[PDB]
């Protein structure tokens with residue numbers, strides 16, 4: 001039960017730009033389509049009926065935490081790009097934490113999509129998906145927005161097979177707990193096997209550490225969703241990288257694309273490509289297919 005009067009008025013105004021009235025939203029609480037730490041995701045209908053995904057934040061009961069989460073995520077309403085998940089709105093009600101309403105992604109998350117044996121995406125398909133992610137990240141980087149959890153599990157595919165960079169802003173959560181570990185300097189659950197070396201060392205995230213994560217995402221694509229470093233313990237990821245060791249080239253990964261991956265994992269952040277450069281390089285590789 002969250003009272004608006006307790007929240008910062010500036011934040012309230014920002015939220016009121018995208019409010020959805022309860023009478024306009026039907027949530028199917030018997031139809032769970034995702035599970036996060038802050039709450040589940042449910043099938044919903046937004047009223048003319050629009051199929052949507054409704055993200056619950058009910059596990060966040062403290063007003064300080066609700067305020068922080070909304071403050072960090074509301075900028076989402078200001079983003080608009082074909083490869084970035086949009087916000088439909090926020091449903092405020094008398095009982096319960098705010099519901100976040102997002103576009104429904106018919107084809108689910110990118111990792112499960114490519115792992116699906118009936119799909120059997122080709123190398124061209126997979127590089128195409130990677131190019132789409134690069135374009136979405138190019139946009140976010142241009143807004144000076146650092147994602148911090150880029151991974152194949154956190155991108156989604158809509159009905160037209162357009163890839164949306166997701167799991168950020170008001171949609172931020174941990175949707176697969178297997179890949180987050182507290183074995184890091186912050187003590188919080190972090191995606192350590194997607195993190196840049198300097199993030200593991202300094203606890204800081206930048207666009208250049210997003211580039212590192214993107215390289216891991218490319219590797220995930222080329223392996224059709226294999227888990228990275230299955231043979232490296234979470235205790236050992238930092239030293240593994242310090243020794244200069246990196247993910248190995250996937251069997252069906254083109255040599256030039258592996259070169260792109262290696263560039264993304266340069267130990268010096270400033271030496272890694274920008275997302276603009278990545279779009280250019282991957283577009284050329286894609287075009288050979």
Ligand SMILES: CC(C)Nc1ccc2nnc([C@@H](C)c3c[nH]c4ncccc34)n2n1
Pocket residue numbers: 033034035041053054055102103104105106108109153154155156166167168171172175
């Ligand atoms: C498979 C699902 C649970 N994974 C993800 C990954 C990232 C992400 N970012 N937002 C969401 C949810 C809120 C979501 C938005 N649209 C959806 N369409 C279908 C299923 C889940 C969502 N996720 N979900």
